[model samples]
Target: SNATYKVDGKGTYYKAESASFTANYDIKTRLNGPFRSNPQSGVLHPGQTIKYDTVMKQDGHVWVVYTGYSGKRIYLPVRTWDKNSNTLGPLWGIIN
Candidate 1:
């Protein structure tokens, strides 16, 4: 009960984590979610732990927009989400 963000994106991530957060979701985990299309989404395997559908920070960093399970709609740079879940997760604000 300690993750609540909404200028209106959406949230629900529990793909399993502890820190150094990743993003790319869409069976549910919201902010529009990222299902790269495997029947929905498919393609993410580099350390594999993504749940980003749409996060957008620019020019300084914090840029994620998911969709890369092979469906490919990725961006990059959400790497270390403020020490990645210091309190639990979801506290993004990117629009540089």
Candidate 2:
């Protein structure tokens, strides 16, 4: 739901280590800062996929982290774990 360039350091963060998944539905994205959420950035349409090295839990949502084309740290929220069924299925393609 949101994209940020850096972690806030106050929330839970972890290394996902090159994990990737395919989007099952359109996912909205927004531009945000380390401390606050912001405007719309882009969208992850169905079937689109990308790799991520980290994931963070902030603003009550789980987010996937990776480096963007701009060579800076980037992260995008994938919505709340509970609300989205908390796993890579239905909402995402769980590739093995």
Candidate 3:
């Protein structure tokens, strides 16, 4: 589907594009989702990374969606996008 947008901070994104990066710190993932109702699933530490096919902006952050070992979707919040620029900032590690 075509990308959708709405009143700032209230919209969701899907298959926007592909993104892969090394996390600078431990990034939490949700077994169910990124919402508050979901339980924490796992973590992606520095040096370890992710390759995702989907993304969504919500709860004041932008999350990357990818498949997990459990054969379900994992939502990893990479960083916040409400300030400065569209850049992901320096909290990300170099892909080594």
- Each candidate structure's count of clashing pairs: 19, 0, 0
Those runs of model 3 whose alpha carbons end farther than 4 Å from true positions after fitting are 1-11, 83-96
Which scores higher on lDDT, 1 or 2? 2
lDDT of 2 by residue, 2-94 (tens): 234344466444444567856666765545532236565566787878787776665555667656687666566665553234343233444
Output the number of the TM-score-best candidate. 3
lDDT of every predicted structure (CA atoms): 0.37, 0.56, 0.65
lDDT of 3 at 53: 74
Tens-digit lDDT string for candidate 1 (9-65): 433232322233333431222223332221322333344455555544323333455
By TM-score, the better pick of 1 and 2 is 2
RMSD of each: 11.7, 6.5, 4.5
What count of clashes does model 2 give? 0
> What's the CA error at residue 91 for candidate 3, in Å?
5.2
TM-score ranking from best to worst? 3, 2, 1
Error of 2 at 32 (Å): 4.5
Give, for candidate 1, the lowest lDDT window spanning 10 residues. Answer: 26-35
